[PDB]
């Protein structure tokens, strides 16, 4: 499946460079947009993201394996929009920065996998209707 593979590459690349702190065509443009929008969501919701992090209490690989639960339950209100999706990915980047400080860099890849899994499994039809990553770039064009 091209959609899962493409989504995974974008989200994992974004989470890895956000943890490292150094920036590394359709996927390329989606990454540029995600860096602009994602870094913005992280700055604007920094206090709210800090509160969610403490409540989740991610300290090891086993906490990352159980992180998918909250993500499925937040999407249980029947609301889907690019704003919610980019907030989920930006929160994933925030968790990936915290994982890097507690020497849990190895947890970024499964975290990226978990975010992609929840996204592509529960919202495949919506993502496809929205022109996937082309639509993501177009929606956030400024």
């Amino acid at each position: 499946d091209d959609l899962y593979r493409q989504s995974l590459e974008i989200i994992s690349r974004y989470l890895r460079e956000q943890a490292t702190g150094s920036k590394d065509a359709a996927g390329r443009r989606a990454l540029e947009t995600l860096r602009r929008v994602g870094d913005g969501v992280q700055r604007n919701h920094e206090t709210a993201f800090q509160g969610m992090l403490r409540k989740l209490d991610i300290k090891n690989e086993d906490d990352v394996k159980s992180l998918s639960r909250v993500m499925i339950h937040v999407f249980s209100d029947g609301v889907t929009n690019w704003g919610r999706i980019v907030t989920l990915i930006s929160f994933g980047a925030f968790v990936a920065k915290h994982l890097k400080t507690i020497n849990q860099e190895s947890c970024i890849e499964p975290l990226a996998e978990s975010i992609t899994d929840v996204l592509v499994r529960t919202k495949r039809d919506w993502l496809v209707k929205q022109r996937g990553w082309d639509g993501f770039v177009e929606f956030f064009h400024v």
Partner: single-chain antibody
Amino acid sequence: QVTLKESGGGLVKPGGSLRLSCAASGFTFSSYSMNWVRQAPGKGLEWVSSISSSSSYIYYADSVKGRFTISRDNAKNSLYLQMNSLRAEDTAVYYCARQVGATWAFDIWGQGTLVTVSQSVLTQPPSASGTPGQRVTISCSGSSSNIGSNTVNWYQQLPGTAPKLLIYSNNQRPSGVPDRFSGSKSGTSASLAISGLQSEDEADYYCAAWDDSLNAWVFGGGTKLTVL
């Protein structure tokens, strides 16, 4: 100056081929989905095809599948329509239209290019009328997969002109549209209201929405508004 300009139109024999071009100016072309919409002389708007920013998602109207191919060259700010196996029914002015990423409204349209080679899912009343200052209402009837699932856009087409975005996201006005125009959506229906009718409101009005079952844009048959 944000513009689109279509080229390549002309006279062709049935069975013949013709390639249209659309030149984009004053914007980042690589960040927009683009569309072709055609209009047979004296008839309504018919959506033809659309292509996303990185060409990953392409759609065609049933009437052109297999015969027409849409493409784009972002390095040349260019949209193309390769038309093969042309039929008399393909005779029309072909418009290039930019799609807004956040709303899917067609905010910029070219002047059109005439192609001479020699049913609408949304319905509207064919005519509407009023005296100056009166209030007129134009309905747009659809169903679950289109108006029932997606927002409605309205276009105004003055005589001899290209269509212009009038309303988007059911009831939002772009800049330059007077507040006498308003829109509403209820169930599978939508409506355009014009308060205090003015002479310049004499035009053809079209509603349009995305259809999830057809995977196509569907335009209403249009309403010819006369100001008596």
